Design a protein around this ligand. Structure first.
Ligand SMILES: Nc1ncnc2c1ncn2[C@@H]1O[C@H](COP(=O)(O)OP(=O)(O)O)[C@@H](O)[C@H]1O
Ligand SMILES: Nc1ncnc2c1ncn2[C@@H]1O[C@H](COP(=O)(O)OP(=O)(O)O)[C@@H](O)[C@H]1O
Ligand code: CLF
Ligand code: SF4
Ligand SMILES: [Ca+2]
Ligand SMILES: [Mg+2]
Ligand SMILES: [Mg+2]
Lengths: 522, 476, 263, 269
């Protein structure tokens, strides 16, 4: 029943007594549900140390992964280029899923197309779909460039992308001159980050490989910046702003910021901004190329060092006080431009915020997960804040990276209880927060469920989730945040101190019980 | 007008290359309510033209995503690489009640997580190891299902044998399901693959068991997935009418409920496209009759409650009248408050199989007119049912491409558009109020009488929200 | 009423000549039968059909350019004695999987309604040289319930017959596929029959029949017709008659014990 | 380095013809490696004096991983110093046989079999069915020179023509070419002539005519080469010439496949 004055949505509509009675009848009558005591006995079991061992013993089953496939990585990178349409060779269900995963996180339209390979296409090959697909897509969406990536069905059957694309041009489906960079992106190998790296090396390789003689390093006096797989707009914006502040000339390769952020002014824009084709062709002429997230930018590092002969500096993702300082000093050395007064003031403010918020932040225990560069950057920052990161998990990480992180943790007296896990899912993490309890969890929306599980054991055992990362689907416009630079550090610092204060308030809000500590000024 | 709509379809098709243009025109039609057969009017359920941005998912989405995923007790393993399981996790709101990770596993993502070693060597050994692992970690699960990703069909993995051997070893039901994405041309074949899978591995288990006590009033809701609690709102109405609901397929469903379904006297089928395969089968094997029903809006619900009740005795028919009497003041109150607000407003809808035709009554119950409608992957029998519901000279589209949809909308100029997530952001930018039909925009339930108040309220807040007035900058 | 039989063997050993002649016998007896050729050779439907060639489902759909945009009347043409004759056809060499075209074609016939047409028997001439996924596909799906392997005294024939057995063993858990008998096609070998029955016994199945090697067959084939049709009077005509009655009569289907190289 | 692949219908002598030829190049002294993609794996048997050669798929199966397996164990050198490896393949009814063929070649290149200044690399292949897994040496430029073994019968020719059609298709991407057609004697009345007209029709030369002799058969039970066991004999001498001719032949041409009909005209004579 519904009062028209105050209509009830699922919640708290199902909380109504008629519905509660109905559900119970349904449960008792047809569900054949295990007793609640049994469910309780089993739930308390998963919270234990004994269960964590069996859980960590798994060699074949992955529960709740913290990683996604390659074409997602490829589609996002393809989005960085001007008037460019991402095109994925293979089955269509993948494209629907990439668009939706992106649409929800960015709450913006995502344009992507598929050649729609079928069961029949599996026996013959992907040649017809690629010719028709390239021809249809160009006629319909008018993209200046079409960047090909492939779905696992295509990778397993073995369609040759280069041969298919050339034959499409040769047969006359699309012009010879029309740009069609392509990258094979097997879902079984790697993650979306690797998928992003492949698409980029391919785009970079297509535009710059044939002509290198004319190119001379440092001739255009700009520094190439390769963002990597990035889902925060503030990050593209912050990197450009500082370089601009510094006066350094630069080329951001793969900039998806305008398109992921187009205005609702009555007209739909399929394409907005992006890295220009000429920017990509004139790239080898830069003084140097800086890679923002080096851990997933390995293939691109090899192409850039080997083909363009740029000496890519070894720099960590510019997160935290020290890494940002390093990035700026390095740009200063490559550009020859000094770090301005304006930027030095910003760093000053970050430190002032750090001195101001140090007592609440000190010693806090965090369990966090993400892509390897971001996690690595966050871990460095927390240690800079004197916080204690207990559980660090990167699903798509590796041994070299884990070695790099342990080194970072070893450098700080803070990283003592810290442990890095790779190849371990959120199910593993759930066990970790239950056995050894972090004050907080820093991660994407997938952790909403880990938090729910902990509160179930008890109020005192709950670990509140703090959302920094990708994908974030239960909060709005967080993708507009910045994690890079001083500004990013400031945003992260405010979210962590305030997450901590917000929690203290909840804990001390009880009347005549804990309100003695429910202070006005903190 | 008819000449104008026909011209609009021709005008739009001019951009496409010939093979694609020739094929597409078969999928766009100006509706004639008079026509009995859909095939004269429109062609449907054909492979999509490449590079045109079709909204269609894969067979895995139809099987893992819609039929199988909602069962609460069983665990569903996405077999193949990590991505399919990941994109689809907790994506769809098939609401359920349970202790997650302990006895109910719907929001959880379970995957074989294929790497290259698995693609070269094959995944059978791993699937068996995964099944053993699943069992130690989650002891209360009542079933296991393996949903095949695209690489499973291609690499020659035999999951039937593993499922048969392990099931036998664990005395647990394991259902191999071959919903490889390459199979079929839309989320549709996956429903069939999933329905057939349910029938071969789970339907006939209590074939010889007569212990469960059955009343003549027992019924099973088939094809209601409880999005936003739609099934629960639908279920309370049938219970109030005096029928007993043994099973829900498959929202908030349990394997026990499914196995107990053949025992039921009548099968009420809400979604024809997804579970009609199982319904026909049940009628042939068990003789249980199945009737399609609609719970969207007070008119369809009253008409539906009335039809279902006729199939039963006078006590049920009498009870049906008490219930319509009981909720009549509630629904009319909603109509009185929201009809003046939504009257005369034109609506355009694009959704995959059941809803484009079904939500028409509710919109009309609010005085809204549905100017055009289409389907992502609907068959022609679906289209046969559609034209009677659609008004005259209204636009109909099957597997509409993104480009076609924007152009149709720009010309037609509907006040509100109901569609999915991919379509929504483009339209809001355009300034046209958009309501997501698939997820009910995180609201609902939209089914039943209780569902109708939420629906009227939702169309009204979105259609009349103050944000639409504000799009053009004041400085011209 | 319908039963499905797959004739399997090494190429050039008589699967096709035998399947067509036997189908003619079943036709003569009056049982409606359909022949689906999965062999790329496509000489599978040549004798019953009086055709130099049968256009395949794969060849036809390529010109039309799409499956299901292809009419059944065009795809399958009825032969002598009323046997529906069809060829799966297959991909161009070096592209994809050959065995797949076989899958696309069978699924084509089923949607189009060739089956449940009350055909007494269905026969798939399938190439037994290589058992791998595309070609062991009729085996994976229960496309051929009864598998009869044509085999000869030669080493490749025995190893191939033996390899097809391995294929049937693997799908033991999944369906109803079974091995019906072994049909020895004579190679004019010295002790061919005792050798095949030696193989038949070790494999767990009986040699259903011994086909004499004869000239009338060669003559009927150039004439582009079956021995039964070219010479009903003849002895060899009588043998295929014997082979057919035997497949209708034989009630033993077994999952085979594939033998070692050494046995 | 020269890579040649032997293609033909099963049961016609491709493994036997290739081992003896390889043994002749061994005797002449060229460094050689034999990679066998035939599912049978009796390919490396005459040279090796091994009854059954453990294959890459068989070996990696126990270990559980590729490249977690050593080349010393995987590749074993035979008589004349020729390196021998068996591609082998999947269990029947599962997978793509040709897919197993690809991992072995990939495994050999990563490990270091090639650029070993091995003069000749010979791929024993099954020519009955031409599919991407099987025609895999053809798609990647695994084997530049392709030699098709054939007989007086229909299946060898249909197979030879089918193999050719395959080579015609992968002509644009790669440098793969058909050197000639190696005849295996069926004691047929006009085998050489039947092959020459077909070869001539195909656009390439019949490189050699090989007599059916029991010397090959006697040698085989002994599990050793004709060239090894009986160097002084006429059959041994025939395989040397084949080896001399293959090293010598400079003509590689894209075959124009003939119609099944043209094959028919060739059939009566
Ligand atoms: N019993 C037999 N007697 C005489 N010739 C036969 C016999 N069986 C097969 N043949 C001949 O041998 C050739 C190959 O037969 P076929 O059925 O095409 O074999 P496959 O189908 O295995 O290639 C044909 O020319 C055919 O006439
Ligand atoms: N000149 C020849 N004389 C007699 N038998 C021969 C001759 N050449 C080849 N063979 C036969 O071929 C067999 C070896 O090759 P085989 O097993 O047929 O495989 P492939 O067809 O792959 O070479 C021997 O068992 C032998 O009977
Ligand atoms: S048609 Fe294939 S079954 Fe369908 S939804 Fe697509 S995936 Fe899966 Fe894709 S996202 Fe990546 S590329 Fe594969 S692994 Fe999964
Ligand atoms: S499965 Fe068989 S037919 Fe298909 S590609 Fe592989 S070897 Fe060829
Ligand atoms: Ca937005
Ligand atoms: Mg044949
Ligand atoms: Mg051999």
């Amino acid at each position: 029943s519904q009062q028209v004055d105050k209509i009830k949505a699922s919640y708290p509509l199902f909380l109504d007594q008629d519905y509660k009675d109905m559900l119970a009848k349904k449960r008792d009558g047809f569900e054949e549900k295990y007793p609640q005591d049994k469910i309780d006995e089993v739930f308390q079991w998963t919270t234990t140390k004994e269960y964590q061992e069996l859980n960590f013993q798994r060699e074949a089953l992955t529960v709740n992964p913290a990683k996604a496939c390659q074409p997602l990585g490829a589609v996002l990178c393809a989005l960085g280029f001007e008037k460019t349409m991402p095109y994925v060779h293979g089955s269509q269900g993948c494209v629907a899923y990439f668009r939706s995963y992106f649409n929800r996180h960015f709450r913006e339209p995502v344009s992507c197309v598929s050649d729609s390979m079928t069961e029949d296409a599996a026996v013959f090959g992907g040649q017809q779909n690629m010719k028709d697909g390239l021809q249809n897509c160009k006629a319909t969406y008018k993209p200046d460039m079409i960047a090909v990536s492939t779905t696992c069905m295509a990778e397993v059957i073995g369609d040759d992308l280069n041969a298919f694309i050339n034959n499409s041009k040769k047969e006359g489906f699309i012009p010879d001159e029309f740009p069609v960079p392509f990258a094979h992106t097997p879902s079984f190998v790697g993650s979306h980050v690797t998928g992003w790296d492949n698409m980029f090396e391919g785009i970079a390789r297509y535009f710059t490989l044939k002509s290198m003689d004319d190119k001379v390093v440092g001739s255009n006096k700009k520094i190439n910046i390769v963002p990597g797989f990035e889902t925060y707009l503030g990050n593209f914006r912050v990197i450009k702003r500082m370089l601009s502040e510094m006066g350094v000339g630069y080329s951001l390769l793969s900039d998806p910021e305008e398109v992921l952020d187009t205005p609702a002014d009555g007209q739909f824009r399929m394409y907005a901004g992006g890295t220009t084709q000429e920017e990509m062709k004139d790239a080898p002429n830069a003084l140097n190329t800086v890679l923002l997230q080096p851990w997933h930018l390995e293939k691109t590092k090899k192409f850039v060092e080997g083909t363009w002969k740029h000496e890519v500096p070894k720099l960590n993702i510019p997160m935290g006080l020290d890494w940002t300082d390093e990035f700026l000093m390095k740009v200063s050395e490559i550009s020859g431009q000094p770090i301005p007064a304006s930027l030095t003031k910003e760093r000053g403010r970050l430190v002032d915020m750090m001195t101001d918020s140090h007592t609440w932040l000190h010693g806090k225990r965090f369990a966090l997960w993400g892509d390897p560069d971001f996690v690595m950057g966050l871990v460095k920052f927390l240690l800079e804040l004197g916080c204690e990161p207990v559980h660090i998990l990167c699903h798509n990480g590796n041994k070299r990276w884990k070695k790099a992180v342990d080194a970072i943790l070893a450098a700080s007296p803070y990283g003592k209880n810290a442990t890095v896990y790779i190849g371990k899912d959120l199910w593993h993490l759930r066990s970790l927060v239950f056995t050894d309890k972090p004050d907080f969890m820093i991660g994407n929306s997938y952790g909403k469920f880990i938090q729910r599980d902990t509160l179930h054991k008890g109020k005192e055992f709950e670990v509140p989730l703090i959302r920094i990362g990708f994908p974030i689907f239960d909060r709005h416009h967080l993708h507009r945040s910045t994690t890079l630079g001083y500004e990013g550090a400031m945003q992260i610092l405010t979210t962590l101190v305030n997450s901590i204060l917000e929690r203290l308030d909840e804990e001390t809000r009880g009347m005549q019980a804990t309100d003695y500590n429910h202070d006005l000024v903190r | 007008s008819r000449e104008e709509v026909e011209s609009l379809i021709q005008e739009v098709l001019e951009v496409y290359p010939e093979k694609a243009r020739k094929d597409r025109n078969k999928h766009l039609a100006v509706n004639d309510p008079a026509v009995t057969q859909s095939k004269k009017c429109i062609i449907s359920n054909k492979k999509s033209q490449p590079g045109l941005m079709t909204i269609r998912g894969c067979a895995y989405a139809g099987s893992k995503g819609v039929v199988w995923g909602p069962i609460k007790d069983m665990i569903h393993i996405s077999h193949g690489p990590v991505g399919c399981g990941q994109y689809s996790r907790a994506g769809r709101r098939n609401y359920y009640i349970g202790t997650t990770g302990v006895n109910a596993f719907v929001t959880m993502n379970f995957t074989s997580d294929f790497q290259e070693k698995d693609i070269v060597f094959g995944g059978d050994k791993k699937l068996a190891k995964l099944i053993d692992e699943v069992e130690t970690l989650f002891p209360l699960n009542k079933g296991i299902s393996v949903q095949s990703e695209c690489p499973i069909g291609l690499i020659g993995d035999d999951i039937e044998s593993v499922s048969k051997v392990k099931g036998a070893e664990l005395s647990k039901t394991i259902v191999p399901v071959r919903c490889e994405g390459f199979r079929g041309v839309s989320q549709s074949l996956g429903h069939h693959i999933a329905n057939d899978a349910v029938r071969d591995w789970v339907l006939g288990k209590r074939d010889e068991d007569t212990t469960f006590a059955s009343t003549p009033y027992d019924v099973a809701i088939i094809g209601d997935y409880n999005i936003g609690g739609d099934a629960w709102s639908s279920r309370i109405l049938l219970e109030e009418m005096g029928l007993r609901c043994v099973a829900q397929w498959s929202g908030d469903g349990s394997i026990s409920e499914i196995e107990l379904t053949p025992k039921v006297k009548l099968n009420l089928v809400h979604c024809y496209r997804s579970m009609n395969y199982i319904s026909r089968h049940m009628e042939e094997k068990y003789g249980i009759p199945w009737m399609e029903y609609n719970f969207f809006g007070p008119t369809k619900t009253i008409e539906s409650l009335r039809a279902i009740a006729a199939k039963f005795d006078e006590s049920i028919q009498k009870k049906c009248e008490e219930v319509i009497a009981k909720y009549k003041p509630e629904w009319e109150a909603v109509v009185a408050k929201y009809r003046p607000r939504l009257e005369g407003k034109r609506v355009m809808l694009y959704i995959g199989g059941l809803r484009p035709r079904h939500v028409i009554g509710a919109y009309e119950d609010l005085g809204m007119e549905v100017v055009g409608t289409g389907y992502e992957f609907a068959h022609n029998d679906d289209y046969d049912r559609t034209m009677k519901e659609m008004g005259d000279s209204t636009l109909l589209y099957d597997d509409v491409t993104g480009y076609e949809f924007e152009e149709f909308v720009k010309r037609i100029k509907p006040d509100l558009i109901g569609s999915g997530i991919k379509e929504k952001f483009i339209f809001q930018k355009m300034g046209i109020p958009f309501r997501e039909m698939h997820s009910w925009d995180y609201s609902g339930p939209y089914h039943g009488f209780d569902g109708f108040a939420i629906f009227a309220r939702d169309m009204d807040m979105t259609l009349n929200n103050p944000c639409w007035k504000k799009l053009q900058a004041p400085w011209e | 009423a319908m039963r499905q039989c797959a004739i399997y063997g090494k190429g050039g050993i008589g699967k096709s000549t035998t399947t067509q002649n036997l189908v003619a016998a079943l036709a003569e007896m009056g049982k409606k039968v359909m022949i689906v050729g999965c062999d790329p050779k496509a000489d599978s439907t040549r004798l019953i059909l009086h055709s130099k060639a049968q256009n395949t489902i794969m060849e036809m759909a390529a010109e039309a350019g799409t499956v299901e945009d292809l009419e059944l009347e065009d795809v399958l043409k009825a032969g002598y004695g009323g046997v529906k004759c069809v060829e799966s056809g297959g991909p161009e060499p070096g592209v994809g999987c050959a065995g797949r075209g076989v899958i696309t074609a069978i699924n084509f016939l089923e949607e189009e309604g060739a089956y449940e047409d009350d055909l007494d028997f269905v026969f798939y001439d399938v190439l037994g040289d290589v058992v791998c996924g595309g070609f062991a596909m009729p085996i994976r799906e229960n496309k051929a319930q009864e598998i009869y392997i044509v085999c000869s005294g030669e080493m490749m024939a025995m190893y191939a017959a033996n390899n097809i057995s391995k294929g049937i063993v693997k799908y033991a858990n999944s369906g109803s596929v079974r091995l019906g008998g072994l049909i020895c096609n004579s190679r004019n070998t010295d002790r061919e029959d005792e050798l095949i029955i030696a193989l038949a016994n070790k494999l767990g199945t009986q040699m259903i029949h011994f086909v004499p090697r004869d000239n009338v067959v060669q003559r009927a084939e150039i004439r582009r017709m079956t021995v039964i049709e070219y010479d009903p009077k003849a002895k060899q005509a009588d043998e295929y008659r014997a082979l057919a009655r035997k497949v209708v009569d034989n009630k033993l289907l077994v999952i085979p014990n594939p033998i070692t190289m050494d046995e």
